[PDB]
Design a protein around this ligand. Structure first.
Ligand SMILES: Nc1ncnc2c1ncn2[C@@H]1O[C@H](COP(=O)(O)OP(=O)(O)OP(=O)(O)O)[C@@H](O)[C@H]1O
Ligand SMILES: Nc1ncnc2c1ncn2[C@@H]1O[C@H](COP(=O)(O)OP(=O)(O)OP(=O)(O)O)[C@@H](O)[C@H]1O
Ligand SMILES: [K+]
Lengths: 346, 621, 284
């Protein structure tokens, strides 16, 4: 497939098999990145980064206000009053040491720790002389409570989002097309791994193709829905064991034209989007997969995955995409539909 | 593997530079070429001025990097000598005078060393990063030029047919890689003495008097590597030729897999091959010897050498070996030893570059210039030669004129000229000598700009004929799609290999001579404004009972269309509508009439040819 | 030294990755040869005019070696030199069944070869075989070193190559010499015979055939005359072919069954009345 080798870029893949929306927006009116944005990034961090930002924030606040206290205990002529070793502390009582027994920046830092985290060792108390120190103490406590509350909110919200682990919904990596119950059918396999059920489940199958219109317009990426062929016309589905969600096509759906040779050059792409709310969490989840033309192994049929064990059914998950190539008619999409004189073109 | 990184930078740099830069180089070199070919005419002078890459822009940085690096170890020494000093002797209170006080302090020197080291590394890396960014451009240029000079001049090959793939073997990836490497490596040659030369002087400046001896040995140690290189290369070349023999023998052996799989020569076919391996193995051992020795030469001479200097330390008779005297000497010895390997490699690289430029010069001076001089009828030219290449004479009463849509075929293989005439009718052969007089307009490339053709050898062009159908064809193009659906799939329904009809050609490994000629004719079919030109292919592509089928496909193609179809074939199986023919025998078009008018002249060869019996196949056998 | 360390780590990784590409095929062997056959004379004789019967509904083989996945009854003529009807549907399977082994194909009781067939010493038994490639090209020497076994065969000059007439042009009256071959050519410089002189190679007595695909019909007829000269030495052979140029004067023929011979019937009109050569009659 050297043409495809050089055509690795030319490819109709609207959504990557992972599920993302491989696209490209541009020429948009980016107003900016306002401040509050950064705070949201604070919420959605991972544990190593959250712990680091937490500890760094506490330590930065402590050191900063310790530096401030050091300046304060400098300007009031306090460090000198202590440094006078005429006695153990000869005239250190009357001079109104602004903060009792604050000798050097290390000591002031011990005081910062002692006053922010509400320890309070008592050996070094604020005194009744310097209003500036009282102002800085008030500021210290207000900022301390706000930072404490914000970091607590961060840690809590990373705790309350422990229900979410990962979306685990599984598709057959390949599609399948076959004949069932007398007419052509399109298949796909859907399974689940989580023990919990998925309530109010629903599926939708859409065809993405570039279209043309008789009036003249062309819609580049055209989307059209297709029925999901349940017994009573309803996109509901119970998911205990994995199953086969078959959107059989008659006329209205765009499968009338399909010719077996054309599949390599086929431009239509099938997209599957299903969704529901998880029973034990309360979150509405939505999983999406893409069925490109290269993955549609035509003519196959799916395998059976249910066995009677002793009293309780056993189920495999290894055989998901394995198929047995049951013989089927070829390109009968129009031939069998637009019934020939035989009315049995197969 | 992201292709996002590529962006549009290559168009701005490599695509623009390669084409534009050499244009100036051609203009200057050719302008000088007019004066005389005794001294002025040459090839590589243009590149320096025309490309104008500032090698110096780096060369300056390179010299700077070498100076900084060589300076570094003296700063290392500086700190070391003053390990110990109380230095309160004068009770100095003088603000340190810039001239002296700053150099001495132990603390400063360390920070200076860090700054110098970072700066040197950065400057060096940046300079030769820019140099590489220029080399890449030079390589793109050289390739662009080889194709520009291979396309529009050398069309007609008559002597280059002896070895034309030698050029595409050397100048493809042995020359351009050589020039890119040599340009990227020039700075080492350019500024290695500025550092080395520094070392002896530096060593002499500070080591003492034994420095000259101390570095004497390494200046001769490097020629040891320069001498081992050549012998190792000779051994490697002999080993490579022996390996080629082994590979060819192995190919022949595996080529007989079904014969040797069980027959009485099953294990026998490898016998000599095993000895072959052993034979080749012996050469490998010889090569290994020099390589190991070279490493020893590169891994010992320095150490050995430095010992000598300390021996010559006993020639200094000083107090002792000051640890601030020999540590810096050892640092200089361990730094100097680096660019020597680069120098030794450049020694061979220069020879490689010279050989490459000589080969390029030979190509551009070997018929690469002069082989292409600078109903819509064109030909009224008396000039006689309708001879191949730069061949001799055979010019008599030459002229030609043909109303198109006429199947004029000079049926003859002896004194044939079928290829010279077929190529020269469109003018692509050097037969345009004389006067070229045409109509006033096509409705100056000889008024034949609407050409289309088929070869006289199997074409087998890029990708395959299945993928050769790229003429604005998503699926079907009305003129050839029909022949595409039904004339194209007619010769061989399907090849043995898988994938069938679609992209059949892409990655289509092989072809039959019949399938090759069928594919060629099919590529003749899928052409637009069909005025086809054929050159006697259907005397060798004579597919009995299938030549009529091909001619019927061409019928619905050309005889059921409004189109001109011609051929110079040599078989009479397709002689229907074969009205016009020649039997020139080394002349231009001089035989032309009606379908039977030639037989009116009753030429004996014409009389025998124009008979009922199998169209006189093999003179009416 | 750090740049060296990083670059050398990368280089080592690349080198070992390149090695692992062939270290997976380092010592694998998947066709064993350990035979316990007792000693046999193994002369070059024709045993009983070559009765070949080893297959009755040749069963599905195994081990994925192009198995025949159906049933094909086999019964040929004893002193038969010419081919018998084998249809394209099973023609490839039969062609593979002429001399090539398999897992579970045609195994069983047989009256053939007068000696054990599958248990014979696999190191030497194979030298007694004979086959022909579809389009014979032997890129090997086979002329200068044609006597790889120790023979002074003394007939490659003009004696039995000319008598075989396949190499008469290249041997009896040729200056190539006793030491000169063609480089990778079964048709490059020796186009007169891509298959060498069988008698010279025996100067065994069993011939195995191939399909006329790249040999000119006249040359093929001359090769048929040589095949008749060899048939004087065999008078019993197995042949595989589908076209009249090779199936024109077949001496012994059969009435087939769906892809393999069902019964022995040399003439052609009797096979025509039945379903014998109806598919063969498609051209005449
Ligand atoms: N038992 C299982 N465990 C995990 N994933 C599964 C299991 N069965 C199927 N899948 C998922 O289904 C997808 C397609 O499976 P498929 O039916 O192709 O079987 P497969 O060929 O074994 O898949 P793969 O080639 O991805 O292993 C795969 O992406 C795989 O992740
Ligand atoms: N590639 C070439 N090499 C050497 N001589 C050539 C070449 N092409 C043409 N000539 C000369 O031109 C003259 C006309 O050649 P002509 O066209 O008859 O060859 P041709 O008939 O095409 O060959 P062929 O019979 O193999 O098709 C010949 O005498 C030949 O010497
Ligand atoms: K909650």
């Amino acid at each position: 497939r050297k043409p495809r080798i050089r055509d690795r870029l030319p490819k109709a893949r609207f959504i990557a098999k992972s599920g993302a929306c491989n696209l490209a927006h541009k020429n948009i009116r980016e107003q900016g990145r306002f401040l509050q944005d950064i705070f949201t990034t604070l919420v959605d961090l991972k544990w190593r980064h959250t712990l680091v930002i937490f500890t760094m924030s506490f330590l930065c606040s402590w050191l900063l206000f310790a530096i401030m206290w050091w300046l304060v205990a400098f300007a009031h002529g306090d460090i000198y009053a202590y440094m006078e070793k005429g006695i153990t502390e000869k005239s250190g009582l009357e001079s109104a040491v602004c903060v009792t027994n604050v000798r050097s920046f290390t000591s002031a830092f011990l005081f910062s720790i002692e006053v922010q985290v509400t320890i309070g060792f008592g050996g070094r108390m604020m005194t009744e002389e310097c209003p500036l120190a009282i102002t800085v103490l008030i500021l210290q406590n207000i900022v301390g409570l706000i930072i404490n509350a914000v970091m607590l909110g961060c840690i809590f919200m990373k705790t309350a989002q422990a229900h979410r682990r990962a979306e685990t919904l599984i598709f057959s990596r390949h599609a399948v097309i076959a004949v069932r119950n007398g007419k052509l059918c399109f298949m796909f396999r859907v399974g689940d791994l989580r023990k919990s059920m998925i309530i109010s489940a629903s599926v939708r199958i859409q065809v993405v193709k570039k279209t043309t219109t008789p009036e003249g317009e062309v819609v580049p990426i055209h989307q059209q829905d297709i029925p999901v062929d349940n017994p009573i016309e309803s996109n509901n589905i119970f998911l205990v064991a994995p199953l086969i969600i078959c959107h059989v096509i008659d006329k209205r759906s765009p499968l009338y034209d399909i010719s077996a040779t054309d599949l390599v050059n086929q431009d239509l792409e099938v997209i599957v989007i299903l969704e529901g709310v998880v029973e034990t969490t309360g979150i509405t989840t939505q999983a999406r997969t893409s069925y490109i033309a290269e993955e549609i192994q035509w003519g196959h049929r799916f395998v059976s995955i249910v066995t009677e064990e002793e009293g309780v059914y056993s189920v495999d998950y290894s055989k998901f995409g394995n198929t047995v190539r049951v013989a089927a008619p070829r390109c009968s999409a129009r031939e069998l539909d637009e019934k020939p004189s035989i009315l049995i073109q197969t | 593997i992201d292709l996002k990184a590529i962006g549009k930078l290559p168009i701005a740099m490599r695509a623009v530079t390669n084409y534009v830069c050499l244009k100036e180089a051609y203009e200057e070199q050719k302008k000088k070429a007019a004066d005389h070919p005794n001294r002025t005419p040459s090839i590589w002078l243009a590149m320096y001025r025309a490309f104008g890459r500032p090698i110096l822009l780096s060369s300056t940085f390179r010299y700077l990097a070498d100076l900084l690096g060589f300076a570094g170890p003296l700063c290392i020494s500086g700190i070391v000598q003053r390990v110990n000093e109380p230095k309160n002797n004068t009770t100095r209170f003088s603000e340190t005078l810039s001239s002296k006080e700053f150099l001495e302090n132990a603390h400063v020197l360390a920070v200076l060393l860090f700054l110098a080291l970072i700066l040197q590394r950065t400057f060096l890396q940046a300079s030769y990063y820019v140099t590489i960014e220029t080399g890449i451009n030079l390589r793109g240029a050289l390739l662009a030029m080889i194709y520009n000079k291979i396309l529009r001049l050398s069309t007609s090959n008559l002597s280059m047919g002896e070895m034309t793939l030698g050029q595409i073997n050397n100048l493809v990836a042995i020359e351009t890689n050589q020039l890119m490497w040599f340009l990227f490596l020039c700075p080492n040659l350019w500024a290695m003495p500025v550092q080395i030369i520094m070392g002896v002087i530096l060593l002499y400046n500070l080591l003492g008097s034994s420095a000259l001896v101390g570095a004497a040995v390494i200046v001769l140690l490097a020629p040891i590597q320069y001498f081992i290189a050549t012998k190792l290369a000779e051994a490697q070349k002999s080993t490579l030729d022996y390996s080629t023999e082994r590979l060819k023998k192995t190919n022949e052996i595996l080529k007989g897999i079904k014969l040797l799989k069980l027959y009485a020569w099953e294990h026998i076919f490898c016998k000599s091959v095993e000895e072959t391996r052993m034979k080749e193995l012996s050469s490998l051992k010889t090569f290994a010897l020099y390589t190991s020795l070279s490493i020893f030469m590169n891994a010992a001479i320095p150490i050995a050498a430095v010992l000598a200097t300390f021996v010559t330390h006993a020639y200094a008779s000083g107090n002792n070996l000051k640890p601030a005297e020999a540590f810096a000497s050892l640092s200089l010895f361990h730094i100097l030893v680096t660019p020597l390997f680069l120098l030794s490699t450049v020694v061979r690289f220069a020879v490689k570059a010279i050989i490459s430029v000589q080969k390029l010069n030979e190509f551009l001076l070997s018929d690469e210039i002069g082989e292409d001089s600078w109903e819509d009828v064109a030909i009224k030219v008396t000039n006689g030669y309708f001879s191949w290449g730069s061949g001799l004479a055979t010019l008599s009463n030459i002229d030609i004129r043909i109303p198109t849509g006429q199947l004029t075929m000079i049926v003859g293989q002896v004194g044939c000229g079928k290829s010279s005439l077929l190529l020269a009718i469109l003018g692509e052969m050097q037969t345009l000598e004389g006067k070229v007089y045409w109509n006033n307009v096509n409705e100056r490339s000889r008024s034949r700009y609407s050409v289309a053709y088929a070869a006289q050898k199997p074409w087998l062009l890029n990708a395959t004929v299945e993928e050769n159908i790229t003429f604005g064809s998503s699926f079907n193009r009305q003129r050839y799609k029909a022949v595409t659906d039904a004339c194209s799939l007619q010769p061989d329904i399907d090849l043995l290999p898988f994938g069938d009809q679609t992209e059949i050609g892409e990655r289509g490994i092989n072809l039959s001579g019949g399938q090759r000629q069928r594919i060629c004719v099919a590529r003749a079919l899928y052409q637009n404004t069909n005025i086809v030109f054929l050159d006697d292919p259907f005397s060798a592509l004579d597919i009995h009972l299938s030549d009529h089928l091909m001619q019927e496909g061409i019928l619905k193609f050309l005889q059921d269309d409004k189109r001109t179809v011609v051929l110079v074939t040599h078989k009479l199986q397709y002689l229907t509508h074969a009205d016009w023919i020649i039997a020139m025998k080394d002349g231009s078009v001089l035989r032309e009439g009606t379908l039977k008018d030639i037989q009116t002249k009753d030429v004996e060869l014409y009389e025998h040819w124009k008979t009922l019996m199998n169209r006189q196949d093999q003179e009416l056998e | 030294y750090l740049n060296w360390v990083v670059r050398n780590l990368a280089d080592l990784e690349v080198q070992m990755g390149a090695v692992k590409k062939v270290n997976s095929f380092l010592t694998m062997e998947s066709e064993n040869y350990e035979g316990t056959m007792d000693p046999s004379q193994v002369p070059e004789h024709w045993p009983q005019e070559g009765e070949i019967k080893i297959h009755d509904l040749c069963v599905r083989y195994e081990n994925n070696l192009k198995p025949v996945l159906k049933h094909v009854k086999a019964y040929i003529k004893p002193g038969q030199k010419v081919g018998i009807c084998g249809r394209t549907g099973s023609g490839k399977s039969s062609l593979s069944l002429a001399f090539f082994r398999m897992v579970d194909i045609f195994d069983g009781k047989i009256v053939i070869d007068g000696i054990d067939i599958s248990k014979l010493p696999l190191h030497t038994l194979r030298s007694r075989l004979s086959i022909i490639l579809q389009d014979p090209i032997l890129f090997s020497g086979s002329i200068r070193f044609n006597l790889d076994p120790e023979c002074k065969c003394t007939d490659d000059r003009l004696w039995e190559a000319l008598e075989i007439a396949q190499l008469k042009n290249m041997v009896k009256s040729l200056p190539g010499g006793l030491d000169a071959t063609v480089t990778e050519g079964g048709e490059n410089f020796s186009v007169g015979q891509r298959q060498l002189f069988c008698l010279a190679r025996a100067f065994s007595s069993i011939l195995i055939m191939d399909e006329a695909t790249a040999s000119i019909d006249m040359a093929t007829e001359n090769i048929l005359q040589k095949v008749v000269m060899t048939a004087f030495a065999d008078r019993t052979v197995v042949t595989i072919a589908h076209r009249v140029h090779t199936i024109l004067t077949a001496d012994l023929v059969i009435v087939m069954k769906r892809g393999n011979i069902l019964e022995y019937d040399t003439p052609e009109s009797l096979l025509a009345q039945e379903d014998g050569v109806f598919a063969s009659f498609v051209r005449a």
